[PDB]
Design an enzyme around this catalytic site. Structure first.
Site, PDB file in Angstrom:
ATOM      1  N   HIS A 167       9.120  -1.527  -8.541  1.00  0.00           N
ATOM      2  CA  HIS A 167       8.483  -1.465  -7.233  1.00  0.00           C
ATOM      3  C   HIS A 167       9.259  -2.364  -6.284  1.00  0.00           C
ATOM      4  O   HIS A 167       9.591  -3.490  -6.648  1.00  0.00           O
ATOM      5  CB  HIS A 167       7.009  -1.898  -7.308  1.00  0.00           C
ATOM      6  CG  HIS A 167       6.365  -2.025  -5.959  1.00  0.00           C
ATOM      7  ND1 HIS A 167       6.046  -3.239  -5.391  1.00  0.00           N
ATOM      8  CD2 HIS A 167       6.036  -1.087  -5.041  1.00  0.00           C
ATOM      9  CE1 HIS A 167       5.529  -3.044  -4.191  1.00  0.00           C
ATOM     10  NE2 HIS A 167       5.508  -1.746  -3.956  1.00  0.00           N
ATOM     11  N   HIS A 211      11.386  -5.126   3.502  1.00  0.00           N
ATOM     12  CA  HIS A 211       9.973  -4.748   3.462  1.00  0.00           C
ATOM     13  C   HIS A 211       9.426  -4.798   4.880  1.00  0.00           C
ATOM     14  O   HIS A 211       9.331  -5.878   5.475  1.00  0.00           O
ATOM     15  CB  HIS A 211       9.171  -5.652   2.529  1.00  0.00           C
ATOM     16  CG  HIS A 211       7.802  -5.129   2.208  1.00  0.00           C
ATOM     17  ND1 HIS A 211       6.833  -5.898   1.597  1.00  0.00           N
ATOM     18  CD2 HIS A 211       7.237  -3.917   2.418  1.00  0.00           C
ATOM     19  CE1 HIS A 211       5.732  -5.181   1.445  1.00  0.00           C
ATOM     20  NE2 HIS A 211       5.952  -3.975   1.929  1.00  0.00           N
TER      21      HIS A 211
END
Length: 1116
Positions: A290, A335
């Site tokens: 992830h 991110h």
């Protein structure tokens, strides 16, 4: 072979190369590098004779040609330090996710080539060295870390301090040869207790050992004596005693029992089985990462190319790219809506191409979360095709197939997982209707890092802030007088002379100190002079050191002796040639160290009861407040500290030259307290605030916004700009300055001055700890949440002049809680205006085109909205896939829906990833997802928690190729993970385990561990259970455990893991992880088996292992 014996000697001698330092402050310098080969280390230092750094070769992950490291990238615009890539190479080594890097630059090309081929051969050879030779290099490594290498021997106290460094406490001179024999005799002596029914030094022959492997170990091949002989010689690797029939000494057998050659894990299963790689991809568990770019948490950590390399080289086969428009037409990966650093899409792609197939032949899937504009998507697509070439999957394997292709059919192919356009359309079909905004950092008005004043020390610390449309969530805080021989003034008269003689006497007798050992003190009789004390024949001798400031220059001398310019020159001279004092001749030897430096420290109180300490510390509204109090008995102290709003105490004992806390030994109280400011003492808490009277009087007073103060006294204005007021009046809007004068409003008059010692400040409630018993557990900060502010009940004001050396500050207040306020600092004016503007807007509310060139690259792994009704029907397309955040997936892997999910997964891929609230990069349990046949169960590979330990255990079958065939029993229509009756007549498995001992358990801090072992089966809920041994006291090097047989029963051994965790019971009755090993249950060997132990990142610990007796039924 012959080439390797010539190659090792070359690197033995060494080379000089400049070294680029990982620390930001340090700039490149040169050193000289060699491989010891008897310790299998790389060493370096200044010149040809010193030691200044070391690397264990057993820790090397990758030896990488070129100048590709962040160390090299730090100076890549600096013309002074822009080397040529041919001249460089990088050693990536370590035992955590973030590898360490040695980034070196040698002039010639062939120094680099020799070092790469050298370290590469040694790297492999060290990793597979048989256990006695590994034990050999370990003993060498411990010995060369003390006064050995100079006199060739070591003290019996230097040997005591070394054993405690490797987890052994001796209850009460030698060379390496006697050192090794000591260790050998000690390990056998300590564990000769173990039940071991098949059993000084005795000899066991080739016949006896073969008999062992057959009656107890189940090694059927050992009916052949020759194989048993080749086995024993393969253990010893002694060229001697090989011509004669091999034997083991009795202690050599016990070491074999503990060794990796005796592992419970059948190494035959480390190979890929190509026969099991022919089912459709949907039938496999696929190792999955992830947000692979991230090294730490989800909000502020660094994006690194090295994480892609590390994850791929751990066998991961599904990695993740978050792509955003980058500065120069090319996407960056980071991110979104966070402060994680950005890396470039091209550097990520070259990293993937470089490392995709180092660890496995089997296909890699790139899951792309894409927020790019169409043009930059187009450059992505062109770059995929151009860089990956035929590696990229670009058309179906079989256009008439009704199922995904096999792993074998997709070898060395990289697949793209991305939204695919509807054929002929320009938007992707979006039939996803979820306006249930998740309440994570993706769906919030603003995220960032801001600073809050500590009310006890008044430093500013960073906290994660998240503003939603209703609330603000803020997190827990994130990321000659110095001379040993100068004791200063010890007393005013005879007491001072008695104190020096006691210090000197005690130090000499206790340590067996040599004659000439000395200290210096301020003279009690001749003011301004000093007295020297040294040991001679069990007696103390005193000498005046005269001091004269004639001619304005310092002159020091012993009586009738030479003149020196400083105390320090005098002492340094007489440590080399003798002084003549009391008519003796003596040279000055060892400085006596001060044992009482704690006496002048803030945290130290010579006279304090336990109740007094509790009363003081309960006034500090932060954890980690502390003091040390002397106790009523001699040589006894206590540390008192605040943790979780409670007060704790522990005894500290002085024994001569050392102090003891639990079993952790220190030089002094000062060195003890200094250690626990840098390392945690209780849970994760360090000692942070030393409490005395002054610290208590200064708590909380950072208030700045509409502050009230209570008048202690009447004050009559002695000037026109001054405030008049009566005792107990509440003076408002107080401007606080130093100098003893404050401004405030009272009785109609505005902003008039008054004496600041005439008032006390009202408590600001914001300085107290927020009640965390009813905090939202699923706020956007997850377990990092400290406090919630309800935005419409707050108001915000900028303070233009800043505060406390922060230039950009605003003030959060609540109109309906007088005196409550938070001063909140930002890193820039722009960041300040954006917070104030968006927070105020929130207060006043009470209420996707896709580039064809990239869509074309999606062949399989095509994301659709999940359609539960399509399952089992002709409508289901094997090429389509769907994705589940953790909480959504939890709704399909329960008793009610789990079988339905199993039916979906036989045909189609499903991906699971953590919930966005897990901002700490923690992981969810993967087993419930796996047991319903989900294939892409994405975990944070950087996090060393139990889910990643299960992942690496699962993919240990196949040698971390990243694809494990799901057992056929659970791709049956009947299989029900919540109903073991559907297993039909699948045979269960009964395991009986006795944990006999352990060797070389790691330390956790300065003490000696008290270890117990927890044994766990994990699988379906009906199979999952835990058990544990007792803990044993003060022994991590070679503990043994009481008789306590364990039983486990496993109805589904096809989905079952055997798990060992070694914990320490610490001094507070807390349990702390030390080591672990997890194995699938299918590949377990029986008998007396070693459990080789790993760390929390699943990396092999050096020598650390359990010994167990494990019996598994039914018998093989």
């Amino acid at each position: 072979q012959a080439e390797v014996l010539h190659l090792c000697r070359s690197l033995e001698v060494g080379t000089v190369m400049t070294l680029f330092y990982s620390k930001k402050s340090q700039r490149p310098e040169r050193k000289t590098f060699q491989v010891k080969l008897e310790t299998r280390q790389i060493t370096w230092s200044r010149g040809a004779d010193k030691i200044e750094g070391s690397i264990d070769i057993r820790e090397i992950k990758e030896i990488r040609p070129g100048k590709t490291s962040r160390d090299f990238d730090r100076y890549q615009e600096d013309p002074a330090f822009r080397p040529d890539q041919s001249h460089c190479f990088v050693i990536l080594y370590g035992m955590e996710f973030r590898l360490k890097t040695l980034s070196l630059q040698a002039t010639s090309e062939d120094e680099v080539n020799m070092w790469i081929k050298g370290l590469t051969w040694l790297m492999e050879d060290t990793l597979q060295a048989a256990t006695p030779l590994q034990i050999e290099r370990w003993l060498r490594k411990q010995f060369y870390s003390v006064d050995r290498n100079r006199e060739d021997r070591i003290s019996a106290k230097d040997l005591k301090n070394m054993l405690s460094q490797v987890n052994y406490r001796v209850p009460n001179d030698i060379t390496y040869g006697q050192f090794a024999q000591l260790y050998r005799s000690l390990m056998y002596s300590a564990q000769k207790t173990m039940d071991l029914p098949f059993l000084e030094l005795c000899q066991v022959s080739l016949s006896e050992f073969q008999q062992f492997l057959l009656e107890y170990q189940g090694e059927l091949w050992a009916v052949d004596r020759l194989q048993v002989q080749e086995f024993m010689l393969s253990f010893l690797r002694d060229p001697l005693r090989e011509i004669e029939e091999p034997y083991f000494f009795l202690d050599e057998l016990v070491t074999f029992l503990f060794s990796k050659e005796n592992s419970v894990w059948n190494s035959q299963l480390d190979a890929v089985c190509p026969e099991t790689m022919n089912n459709p991809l949907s039938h496999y568990w696929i190792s999955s990462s992830h947000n692979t770019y991230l090294t730490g948490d989800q909000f502020f950590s660094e994006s690194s190319l090295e994480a892609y390399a590390r994850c791929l080289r751990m066998g991961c086969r599904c990695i993740e790219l978050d792509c955003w428009d980058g500065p120069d037409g090319m996407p960056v990966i980071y991110h979104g809506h966070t402060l994680t650093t950005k890396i470039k899409f091209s550097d990520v792609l070259h990293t993937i191409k470089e490392h995709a197939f180092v660890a496995s032949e089997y296909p890699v899937i790139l899951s792309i979360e894409d927020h790019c504009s169409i043009a930059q998507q187009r450059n992505m697509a062109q770059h995929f095709r151009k860089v990956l070439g035929d590696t990229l999957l670009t058309k179906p394997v079989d256009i008439a197939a009704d199922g995904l292709p096999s792993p074998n059919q997709l070898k060395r192919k990289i697949l793209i997982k991305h939204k695919k356009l509807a054929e002929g359309s320009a938007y992707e079909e979006v039939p996803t209707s979820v306006m249930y905004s998740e309440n994570d950092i993706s769906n919030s008005i603003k995220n960032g890092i801001l600073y809050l004043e500590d009310p006890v020390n008044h430093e500013w610390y960073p906290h994660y802030f998240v503003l939603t449309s209703s609330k603000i969530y803020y997190s827990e805080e994130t990321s000659h007088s110095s001379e040993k021989w100068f004791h200063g003034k010890l007393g005013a008269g005879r007491d001072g002379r008695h104190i020096a003689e006691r210090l000197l006497t005690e130090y000499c007798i206790e340590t067996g100190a040599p004659d000439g050992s000395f200290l210096v003190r301020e003279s009690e009789t001749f003011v301004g002079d000093y007295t020297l004390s040294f040991w001679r024949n069990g007696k103390v001798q005193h000498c005046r050191i005269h001091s004269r400031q004639d001619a304005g220059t310092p002159k020091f001398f012993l009586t009738d002796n030479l003149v020196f310019d400083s105390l320090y020159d005098l002492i340094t001279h007489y440590q080399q040639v003798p002084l003549r004092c009391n008519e003796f001749e003596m040279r000055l030897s060892e400085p006596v160290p001060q044992t009482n430096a704690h006496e002048s420290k803030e945290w130290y109180h010579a006279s304090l009861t336990r109740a007094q300490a509790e009363h003081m510390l309960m006034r500090v509204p932060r954890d980690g407040a502390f003091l040390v109090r002397k106790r009523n008995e001699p040589n006894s102290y206590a540390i008192s500290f605040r943790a979780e709003g409670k007060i704790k105490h522990c005894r500290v004992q002085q024994e001569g030259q050392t102090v003891m806390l639990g079993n952790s030994e220190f030089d002094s109280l000062v060195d003890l307290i200094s250690y626990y400011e840098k390392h945690p003492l209780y849970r994760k808490m360090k000692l942070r605030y030393p409490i005395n009277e002054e610290a208590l009087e200064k708590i909380g007073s950072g208030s700045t916004f509409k502050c009230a103060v209570k008048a202690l006294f009447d004050y009559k204005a002695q000037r026109e700009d001054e405030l008049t007021f009566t005792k107990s009046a509440i003076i408002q809007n107080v401007e606080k300055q130093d100098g003893g004068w404050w401004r405030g409003d009272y009785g109609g008059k505005k902003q008039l001055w008054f004496p600041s010692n005439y008032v006390e400040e009202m408590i600001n409630p914001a300085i107290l700890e927020p009640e965390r018993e009813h905090l939202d557990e699923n706020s956007p900060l997850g377990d990092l949440l400290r406090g919630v502010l309800d935005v419409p009940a707050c108001q915000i004001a900028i303070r233009p002049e800043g505060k406390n050396n922060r230039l950009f500050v605003f003030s959060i207040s609540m109109p309906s809680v007088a005196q409550w306020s938070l001063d909140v600092a930002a890193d820039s004016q722009e960041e300040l205006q954006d917070w104030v503007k968006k927070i105020r807007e929130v207060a006043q509310t009470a209420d996707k085109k896709i580039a064809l060139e990239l869509s074309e690259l999606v062949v399989y792994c095509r994301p659709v909205p999940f359609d539960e009704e399509k399952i089992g029907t002709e409508r289901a397309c094997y090429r389509d896939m769907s994705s589940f955040p953790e909480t959504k997936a939890e709704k399909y892997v329960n008793k009610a829906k789990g079988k339905k999910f199993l039916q979906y997964n036989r045909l189609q891929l499903s991906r699971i990833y953590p919930k966005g609230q897990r901002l700490d990069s923690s992981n969810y349990d993967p087993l419930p997802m796996w047991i319903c046949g989900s294939q892409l169960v994405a975990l944070n590979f950087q996090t060393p928690d139990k889910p990643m330990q299960m992942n690496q255990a699962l993919f240990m079958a196949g040698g971390h190729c990243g694809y494990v065939l799901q057992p056929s029993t659970m791709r049956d229509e009947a299989f029900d993970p919540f109903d073991k009756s559907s297993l039909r007549g699948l045979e269960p498995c009964v395991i009986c385990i006795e944990v006999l001992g352990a060797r070389h358990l790691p330390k956790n801090g300065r003490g000696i561990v008290c270890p117990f072992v927890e044994i766990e089966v994990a699988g379906a809920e009906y199979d999952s259970t835990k058990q544990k041994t007792e803990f044993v006291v003060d022994n991590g090097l070679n503990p043994v455990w009481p008789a306590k047989p364990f039983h486990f029963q496993i109805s589904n051994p096809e989905f079952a893991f055997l798990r060992f965790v070694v914990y320490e019971e610490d001094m507070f009755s807390d349990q702390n992880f030390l080591a672990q090993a997890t194995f699938p249950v299918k590949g377990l060997k029986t008998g007396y088996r070693a459990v080789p132990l790993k760390n929390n990142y699943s990396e092999d610990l050096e020598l650390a292992s359990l010994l167990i007796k494990i019996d598994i039924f039914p018998a093989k």
